[PDB]
């Protein structure tokens, strides 16, 4: 049970098939577009997970055939938002699918998010945020990595994705293969609107650099790191003392 | 005599000071602003090198003391373009520096640029270009990388600006600390406009990986590699086979 939705209103309905293979029925779309899910646990293992976002039954690649989500009622959604609600974090060490509808795929978790092998099939653009969303008047005006210095950590299997893909954190530790329509790696401790404008920058109490090693294949690399006194570190596959 | 200037009528006047210091007077600006110098060689030792593009004697960070460049009639030079003309690849070893009025600054060579401990003083923009400029009835339409292998090293004493930096190759092989306002790396075989906006890409026949291990301390760092079966490869201090 790597993935444990919340109790509440925003808890998705989650189940694995056979190999471990977990399936996530997300919640009903709101006026925004947004599925907003809510976790005390977010965990993928090797079998991955897929994201229920279908209308009809189909063929998902990492679950085989699958029917459709209940929850949608008609409107399949736009943005499918896991967030973390615990103290705990994330280990992704599988590949994440969005069944049926292409969607944008968010998972945010501030305690810190951790990346080996893992990838995003059938998303539009993939975001990993080592923040919390921000909610106003019921509606998602952003995310914060404000006050936090946990680290987005990509192991030495790596990261492999069609579609964009975000990576939001205080700090990264990458050792591995990133590939990616387009690569956006925004560090140091900042608001973000919905769309990854950076918004504010906080000048952290330490150092928050980011580390890169292993490779790039993608159409545009961009890295902002607005931490003050921080910067960005191509080493080798280690980064001793 | 790193710095050798061509014997026509875009070949700059060129000298040096104690030290060995040099220091070019620039050609005369044309009306696009641009002054555009012609070289047999470019290269830049420890103690530097000056661009002077100043209407009035003052007191330059390189060389000292200075007079105004009388090629300049009234008019300093809004870009500074140094191109070499001949087969001989450019070796920067110190600081450039725009004395008097602050430039953009570009250095081509299809050669091979070499930088090692460079860095670039009073230019908004500096663009070291492993590629040639591009003229169409007598105008800059901007640069050309194709049908080109050759690379842009930087050396592990690094390089350093305030300004933008424009790095323009076939590839990069990156073993230092880079900083500057902006970087923004642009490899593979290309044409580009004026202001880096890059035309077209060819299939090179072998590939162009660029590599960068060191760091970065910048405030927007971008890399592009339009090359088909190529990408970037952030490794440790050597890239064995």
């Given at each position: ?75 399949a959604a736009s943005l499918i938002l896991n967030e973390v ?90 050792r591995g293969k990133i590939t990616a329509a387009e690569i ?58």
């Amino acid at each position: 049970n790597g993935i444990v939705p919340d109790a509440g209103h925003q808890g998705p309905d989650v189940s694995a098939v056979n190999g471990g293979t977990q399936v996530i029925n997300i919640v009903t779309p709101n006026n925004e577009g947004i599925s907003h899910n809510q976790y005390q646990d977010f965990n993928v293992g090797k079998p991955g997970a897929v994201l229920n976002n279908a209308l009809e039954a189909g063929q998902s690649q990492l679950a085989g055939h699958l029917n459709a989500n209940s929850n949608l009622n008609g409107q399949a959604a736009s943005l499918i938002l896991n967030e973390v609600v615990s103290r705990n974090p994330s280990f992704l060490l599988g590949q994440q699918e969005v069944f049926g509808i292409a969607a944008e795929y968010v998972l945010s978790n501030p305690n810190g998010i951790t990346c080996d092998g893992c990838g995003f099939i059938n998303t539009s653009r993939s975001s990993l945020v080592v923040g919390n969303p921000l909610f106003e008047n019921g509606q998602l005006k952003g995310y914060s990595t404000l006050n936090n210095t946990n680290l987005l950590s990509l192991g030495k299997n790596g990261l492999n994705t069609t579609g964009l893909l975000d990576l939001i954190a205080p700090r990264i530790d990458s050792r591995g293969k990133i590939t990616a329509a387009e690569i956006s790696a925004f560090t140091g401790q900042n608001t973000f609107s919905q769309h990854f404008d950076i918004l504010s920058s906080q000048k952290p109490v330490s150092a928050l650099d980011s580390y890169f090693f292993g490779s790039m294949q993608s159409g545009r690399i961009r890295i902002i790191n607005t931490a003050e006194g921080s910067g960005v570190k191509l080493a080798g596959h280690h980064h001793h003392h």
